[model samples]
Target: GQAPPGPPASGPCADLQSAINAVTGGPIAFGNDGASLIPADYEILNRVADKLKACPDARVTINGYTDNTGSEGINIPLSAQRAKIVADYLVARGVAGDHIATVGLGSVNPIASNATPEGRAKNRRVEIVVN
Candidate 1:
């Protein structure tokens, strides 16, 4: 009989998590008011893509969020757009479209208080979760 299939190729179970942590550990920078992708964003995406390439079949879940400076009406759409933009960028970098998912948490899951400029800045970011 042929040898056992052995372990599959690289995946989140391998170096992907480490890569993800390294990427996410830094502030995933974006343009003012969540409108555009900044230069650092491109670097982050390239690093993310390189890591994700190891796990071609993995599903990427993007959770977008915003600070409480705006109403839900504005925050929701803004947050959603952030998620979609990142997802689109990732797709352009070669990740499978169907393997990605996104959610706009709006002002619901603030990582920091929205009461201060620093906190607000911290709150406006997209988190990447892989499965």
Candidate 2:
């Protein structure tokens, strides 16, 4: 027997979510004014690549954000650059490029107030939403 298609959230998309959430404790954390993925973050990328590869149909939306410490000129590209790098990481691992999309939000919906170092750090992030 077979069943109807399910929501993306009900698939491996949800299962692999927890593994990536620990990233808040900091995606692949980036340093101040930097878009490079720190050496240690490859572990997270590796985990995600494995999951996405296993669940071939899952689509990912990578939204990158930044703290309001700089001009739009810098933050927008910075956020986008951050997002593109993550996408590249996944693509390099053989994940299909067509199933992935990336965008830079540029300090648009900051989850935390950008008034302190801790808050700014929290704001600089990329979110991979499996859809």
Candidate 3:
């Protein structure tokens, strides 16, 4: 809603996946190849959790994805791992892991075609759906 640097939102994290892809239209710049949030970002996400009371009741989704440049076997698990990393981060920040749904769509869904480096980079990302 307020653009990524604002706060971790509620509801569905993947709902803003397309918007994030548009805002950060480069590579997956959240953190590492296997993780999605920087400490600052994690703090923001935690702040999002804190922003609303009764956090255990707050549900969100973390979906992982990758570029078509890699194999599905690697990308699938890699994407899921990324999502798990996010879930872990949220849990550490006090968002219930049980409230988090980690899913890996891998390279199956592409915001932009993988014909260019930019598109491939955009695909290699994990989206946080906070509702």
Candidate 4:
């Protein structure tokens, strides 16, 4: 049961989110400021490139999501910037430029209710969906 070729709910993009934020970057159990995705999130970069190389034909879409905490205008661009950062990391690791695309979905999908600080943190993430 597949939905043809539209957009996947989760793929490498989701993996990127889990790897970069929740796992590699040390999910700040308590914080509020913006968490920049950096090379220090080495584990994520390594694993993501591995996953990318596994499927040569697979095109990766980088999506950045944020919590419902600010104006969409601001969050939209911020999310895009986040996605670009992730894409740049991938490219730097030798992944082909043609295999990656970046997008920003601001506060669109909520893994956790954005009412609490914790939920907001979870919402603010960068996802990688492989197409």
Candidate 5:
């Protein structure tokens, strides 16, 4: 006989990593060198928020980063804004604000090289970590 079906994939923040991966698992295409989060980005973030709702006690860390196309002065504030926007969106979606922390890594700690366009694009992203 066939094996029994597995349980549904549901739990506190169970799909959190999947949601993050859905968005940042590639070159996010977050247009604008220094700008706020875009609607397209929200579609994926909504998934994260839903997962987070299940895990109310979970703490989240949103780290915004940028490519080396601009100076730190511009990159830092821009990254901060991006992180803030994500946190705010999550809060609006029912995740507790106090449970979220935002950080701006500027152009540092890049996952890709700044020497190429594709690499730069990959570097410009927001990293979501749940604790």
Candidate 6:
């Protein structure tokens, strides 16, 4: 074989849970009080696309969130934008756009405490769910 058989992939998509974990493990970084892609996040999101594409039948749900320094009016849209930006990038990377879903959490259900900059930065991220 020309390729000589490459190493086996962990196959995150072999099961739903692992795939979800793969996507949500580290959310894409975002700027505080704004919604946009991190220049360095493409590689991270690339794996996310790989995992999502692995499960063609599964839906890609992006649960977007924001820091607690803003009101819902500002937070909601920003959160949704974060989700969309991630989704759009994945789609651009050859993921199925039709199978992707997005939601704006409006600074709710934070995985990290929002009382400090470190925690707030972690909270300002978009989590992915493979369903």
- What C-alpha lDDT values do all the predictions have? 0.72, 0.73, 0.63, 0.66, 0.72, 0.72
lDDT of 6 by residue, 1-131 (tens): 24333326532345654654665566666653534454665576777788677776666678888778777677787778888887898898899887788878878878677778888787778887765
Runs of candidate 3 with Cα error greater than 4 angstroms are 1-31, 34-42, 51-55
Residue range 50-89, candidate 3, lDDT tens digits? 4322445456677888888887788888788877876776
Q: For candidate 1, lDDT tens digit of each residue in 1-131?
A: 64453447523355565677697685455557625665655667767877676677676777778888977677777777777787887788888877777778878767787778888877778777776
Residue 18, candidate 4: Cα error in Å is 12
TM-scores of all candidate predictions against the true structure: 0.76, 0.73, 0.64, 0.68, 0.70, 0.73
| Per-candidate clash tally | 0, 1, 11, 4, 0, 0
Per-residue lDDT of candidate 4, residues 1-131 (tens digit): 74466545534343443444444453222223466554356556666776576554567777788888788778888778777776777787778766788888888877898779788878877777666
Better of 5 and 6 by lDDT: 6
Q: Which stretches of model 1 miss by more than 4 angstroms?
A: 1-15, 38-41
Q: For model 5, how does the per-residue alpha-carbon lDDT over 100-127 read when each residue is reduced to its tens digit?
A: 8888778887777888888777677777
List ranges where model 6 is wrong by over 4 Å: 1-13, 31-40
- Indicate which candidate wins on TM-score: 1
Q: What is the C-alpha RMSD of each candidate to the true structure, in Å?
A: 6.5, 5.7, 8.9, 6.8, 9.9, 9.6
Clashing pairs in 5: none
Give candidate 6's whole-model lDDT.
0.72
Model 2 alpha-carbon drift over 4 Å, by segment: 1-19, 22-27, 32-35, 38-40
Instruction: Report clash pairs, candidate 6.
Output: none
Model 4 misses residue 14 by how many Å?
A: 16
lDDT of 1 at 66: 84
Candidate 2 per-residue lDDT over residues 44-130, each given as its tens digit: 776677777877677677889888987876887777888888889989889988777788888887778777878778688888767
- C-alpha lDDT of residue 111 in model 2: 71
- Scanning candidate 5 in windows of ten residues, the lowest lDDT window is 2-11
Q: How accurate locally is residue 54 in candidate 1, as Cα lDDT from 0 to 100?
A: 67
How high is the lDDT of residue 21 in model 5? 67
